[PDB]
From a paper:
In stark contrast to most characterised dehydratases, [name] is small (121 aa), monomeric, co‐factor independent and utilises a non‐activated nucleoside, rather than a free monosaccharide, as a substrate.
Mutants E108Q, K16R, [name], Y55F and Y89F were produced and purified, affording diffracting crystals of the same morphology and space group as wt [name], which raised our confidence that the mutants folded correctly and that the effects seen are specific to interactions with each mutated residue rather than global effects on protein folding and structure. KGaAThe biochemical data were in accordance with the data obtained from structural analysis of the mutants. In the [name]–uridine complex, the critical interactions between 5′ OH and Y55 and Y89 remained the same as in the WT‐uridine structure, additionally the hydrogen bond between K16 and E108 with 2′‐OH, as well as the π‐stacking of the uracil ring with F103 are all preserved.
Residue numbers in the entry: 2 to 121
Write the structure that this text describes.
Amino acid sequence: TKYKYTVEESERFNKHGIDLTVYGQVDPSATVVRVSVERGQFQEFFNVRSSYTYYVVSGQGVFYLNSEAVPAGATDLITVPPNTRIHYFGSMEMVLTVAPAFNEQDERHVRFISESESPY
Ligand SMILES: O=c1ccn([C@@H]2O[C@H](CO)[C@@H](O)[C@H]2O)c(=O)[nH]1
């Protein structure tokens, strides 16, 4: 039984301005990944099934949740329910929980965001 997953073993890639570490643990109830962001996620999406919960390890930023600004700093917990439009700006390290388990097909692209819109 493989309980532990390391960064060394993970899939690491850039998507829409963020750096993701996807450990590749399989569990139907939740997917937990690491997010590093220097300026922002320059894409707005919503997920029809899963809540996205961001724990801010370090840094600061601002989430836009159905266009509402939600400031965030280190140790804050940002919980986004399904069917909520999400993008964000900031310089942050985060732990993201997608529950139930992340499925890319549950995601709906709304728009791209201009890289100049980020004040970070
Ligand atoms: O397993 C996961 C979890 C999250 N994300 C992406 O991480 C971002 C979280 O803001 C979104 O673009 C979401 O699609 C993935 O690509 N895979």
